[PDB]
Chain length 150, copies 3
């Protein structure tokens, strides 16, 4: 058995907050707006994993209104989501993710995002793909995941 | 043997139509514009299914020109599409779907959509995921001009 | 083993360039803007394929700044990508693609794009699905600024 999931998120850009994407802090004048660290890539990854196993989305498991998830580290939240997936008997097949952002340039941080995502999904880096495009009020991300019994 | 499909659709919100999403009636003062009931989520589920078996899209099977599909029930269209998938030898593995909408809030109706989609794919509700998110006021859906959806389906021999 | 990949791309329609989509030249007033032939659909197919094997995106293999990307034939680029997939031991499961464009009407060329993509992926036409949808006048594609495409691929050991 394999199962498929998909995630899509957008976060608003704003001054004063730090920019964190795929678990990596990126030097920039504007961070993303959110109640947790607002890592839009790790949120999308988490939502794709939740969706593959039929467990709604991260809003359902870590609500915005829950003070416990104020300034939450989104890598920790991904680890908990991955606990839910493992409990259903699944491991990672592979994941393919896209960051949509006009600025900053993501290329110098992509390889550490992949390591970080792999770590959070307990997989090898060869199972994780991250790309960026630009095509500027926010940063979006999309992810598609295939999980397998294991 | 597994096959993947993907659907993407977007409908304009207007005054003076019902809002029907995922086969569920949502009491709301705007609804979706289209030749059929405009059910954006069932259209993307149906497109994902047709995509997975190489049978085009709903436009091919139920065109806007042909007048007989005027105000058609999108649940009924989904069942006809599911008939095509079954004839090819496939059943549902699982489906993950996203509604993209600033308003209204979808969360009270999610479980019902999942039930209705499960019924249309002849599947267990554990096989169907539906989530709703906003674009944080950004874009055509962010400013309530329309509702978008996406769906990704995995089907398997059965 | 099966692997999944996803691609997404958007290109501007501009005056006096050919419109090449899915490897097929379509008669039209405008073409897509880019360094290569700007075939938005073959770019997304290529990206989905590279994504499935963890090899980045077309920009990693054929940067904009590479003089052989200038006016490159995106079908040849797809064949290069497919060689990468084949060296890892995979063949096509199936692919489902969507062209989002307000105009022109894709429907007369779809079958040819399917055959071309099938040829590039060394597969049967039954494994390739391509659908075309308009945006209902909404967004950047809805206001004829461009053409968008998405593709989801399932590959398998072969
Ligand atoms: Mg988020
Ligand atoms: Mg529709
Ligand atoms: Mg391109």
């Amino acid at each position: 058995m394999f199962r498929i999931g998909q995630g899509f998120d957008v976060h608003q850009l704003v001054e004063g907050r730090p920019l964190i994407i795929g678990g990596i802090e990126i030097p920039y004048e504007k961070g993303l707006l959110g109640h947790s660290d607002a890592d839009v890539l790790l949120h999308t990854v988490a939502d794709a994993c939740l969706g593959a196993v039929g467990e709604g989305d991260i809003g359902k498991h870590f609500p915005d209104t829950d003070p416990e998830f104020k300034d939450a580290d989104s890598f920790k939240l991904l680890q908990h989501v991955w606990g839910i997936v493992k409990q259903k008997g699944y491991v990672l097949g592979n994941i393919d993710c896209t960051i949509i952002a006009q600025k900053p340039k993501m290329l110098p941080y992509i390889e550490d995002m992949r390591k970080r995502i792999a770590e959070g999904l307990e997989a090898d880096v060869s199972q994780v793909n991250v790309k960026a495009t630009t095509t500027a009020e926010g940063i979006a991300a999309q992810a598609t995941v295939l999980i397998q019994k294991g």
